[PDB]
Each structure stands twice: as structure tokens, then as C-alpha cells.
């Protein structure tokens, strides 16, 4: 399948310690990524994708939008 561009967050976890998360980016849905996403950035430097199916999601709809 001729690979078009993809979402940065194709898969996610609900499982993360909030103590670790220094920051939080949210980006809308777009033509280059159908689902919206949010990128939690940790203390050590990594970034992670967190689930919008979980009730980490009601702090999105309101948040950016």
C-alpha cells in the first residue's frame, strides 16, 4: 500500500505515571492525520501518545477545542 504520510500516534497507552509528564502537546484532527492526538512529553525526554478512548479524552475536547 503506497505509504502516504501517517499519524505520529498510530498506537497509544493509557498506562503512564503522570508524575513523569513534564508537558503536553495537543494537535487537532487534520487531512494528514484523521484522528486527533496528544503527545505527553516525559521527564527523561521521550514523548508518548495517550489514548483518546479512555477518559484522558474529556480533557481534550474542552482543552484545545
Amino acid at each position: 500500500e503506497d505509504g502516504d504520510l501517517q499519524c505520529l500516534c498510530v498506537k497509544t497507552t493509557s498506562q503512564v505515571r503522570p508524575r513523569h509528564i513534564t508537558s503536553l502537546e495537543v494537535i487537532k484532527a487534520g487531512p494528514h492525520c484523521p484522528t486527533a492526538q496528544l503527545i505527553a512529553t516525559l521527564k527523561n525526554g521521550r514523548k508518548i501518545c495517550l489514548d483518546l478512548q479512555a477518559p484522558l479524552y474529556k480533557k481534550i475536547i474542552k482543552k484545545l477545542l
Epitope: 484532527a29 487534520g30 487531512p31 484522528t35 486527533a36 477545542l65
Partner: antibody, heavy 119, light 108 residues
Framework: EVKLVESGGGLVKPGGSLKLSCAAS????????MSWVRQTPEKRLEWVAT????????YYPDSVKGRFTISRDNARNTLYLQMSRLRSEDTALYYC????????????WGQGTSVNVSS | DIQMTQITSSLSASLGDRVTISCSAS??????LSWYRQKPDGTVKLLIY???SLHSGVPSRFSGSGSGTDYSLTISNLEPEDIATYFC?????????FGGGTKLEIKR
């Protein structure tokens, strides 16, 4: 209600011009991606245009590139579709729509302003 | 371009029935499908987004499903407000393409 009134639709002669308008009401218009879709007389639906709410880009399909020109005015809460060099095929009912937020489908559509196009 | 194929132009179903309305896709979309309903006259309104998540103000009898290239909308106990045409869109990639539409009519 989220509401989308549309206007400017009418009869135009082939190779002509027309500017459709779509008045928005019931949401933060500036922070929403907006689009235009049309319904052929044949009946089928057809994507026409989209515009990024971070002011940025416009996206059109091959069938109308360069002829059509989507544009917004966040001050007015109004979305324009600037049509020119019209054709037989462009005869259709033109809906303005709202993309956006979590999953990027068109969640709200207007009544629909009509564009009959003949000589 | 993704050819979105809604195989049954129209389909017959008596009132109070269970209706399945299939929409197949030329290539894999990532359950980024939609469903729309157009009242014979009225505007169209978003029914389901993603593949199965229902839009606000949509009855509970509407339930989407599917994965890959095949998808279905399905309406338990059909009500006369639902005699209409139904459309599937995909939004996985540009250009956004719709289905041919399925008209719903009542069997006699």
C-alpha cells in the same frame, strides 16, 4: 445549534464566475477546519474544497483545481468559495460543511445553496 | 483516489425491521469512515464517525461497524424518519470520496 447558512447560488452562463458564501454560527469558527461539498443532479456527493483553521492551506480535488478558490474570513464568520470558468459538470447543489476536532468527518452541513449552470 | 462502493442503489425494508447497509472501499482506510443520512428534502446530518462512534443526538438504534475495506451501518427497529438515502465517506486521505448512496424504501 451549530448553524451554517449559505448564499450566492444562482444561474450562471458557461465560462462564468460566481462567489458562494457560508455564514457560520454556534462555534469558534476560527478554530475549525471548513469545507465545501456538492451534490450532482445525478445525485452523488463530491468533495470540493477544504481549508486549515490554522489559517494555513487549501486543498482541492483534481476536478476543480485552479478554477475554484476556497477562502475564509474569521472576522465575519464567513466562508467563501470563489468559482470561475464554470462548466456543465459544475451544475450541482453546493453545501458548506464543518470538519474537525477529534475525528475529521463533516459533522455539520448547511441547508445547501444551489448552482444551476446553463446557457 | 479511493473508490467508495455502496453496492445497493436502493433497498426494501418493512417498518420496524433490522437493516444492514454495506459500504466497501477500494483500498484500506483505517476505519476512518463516516455515515451520513439525507432526508428526502432536508439537509444531511452526520450519523456515525470513525467506524462506529455515534454523533451526538443520534438514536441508539444506529450502530456502525467494520474494518479494513468493508464496513456496515445498521439500524435496528427501523422508524419512518429513516426512510432516506445514506452515504458513507472516508477521510483517511485526500481526496475525500463518498459512496454512491443507498436509498431506503418500504416493502409492500
Amino acid at each position: 445549534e451549530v448553524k451554517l447558512v449559505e448564499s450566492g447560488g444562482g444561474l450562471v452562463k458557461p465560462g462564468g464566475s460566481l462567489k458562494l458564501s457560508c455564514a457560520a454560527s454556534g462555534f469558534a469558527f476560527s478554530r475549525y477546519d471548513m469545507s465545501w461539498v456538492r451534490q450532482t443532479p445525478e445525485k452523488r456527493l463530491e468533495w470540493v474544497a477544504t481549508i486549515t483553521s490554522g489559517d494555513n492551506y487549501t486543498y482541492y480535488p483534481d476536478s476543480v483545481k485552479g478554477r475554484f478558490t476556497i477562502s475564509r474570513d474569521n472576522a465575519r464568520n464567513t466562508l467563501y468559495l470563489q468559482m470561475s470558468r464554470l462548466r456543465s459538470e459544475d451544475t450541482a447543489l453546493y453545501y458548506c460543511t464543518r470538519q474537525g476536532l477529534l475525528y475529521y468527518a463533516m459533522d455539520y452541513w448547511g441547508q445547501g445553496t444551489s448552482v444551476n449552470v446553463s446557457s | 483516489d479511493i473508490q467508495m462502493t455502496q453496492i445497493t442503489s436502493s433497498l426494501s425494508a418493512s417498518l420496524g425491521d433490522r437493516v444492514t447497509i454495506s459500504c466497501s472501499a477500494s483500498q484500506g482506510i483505517n476505519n476512518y469512515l463516516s455515515w451520513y443520512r439525507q432526508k428526502p428534502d432536508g439537509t444531511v446530518k452526520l450519523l456515525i464517525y470513525y467506524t462506529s462512534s455515534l454523533h451526538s443526538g443520534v438514536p441508539s438504534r444506529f450502530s456502525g461497524s467494520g474494518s479494513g475495506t468493508d464496513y456496515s451501518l445498521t439500524i435496528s427497529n427501523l422508524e419512518p424518519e429513516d426512510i432516506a438515502t445514506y452515504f458513507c465517506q472516508q477521510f483517511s486521505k485526500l481526496p475525500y470520496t463518498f459512496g454512491g448512496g443507498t436509498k431506503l424504501e418500504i416493502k409492500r
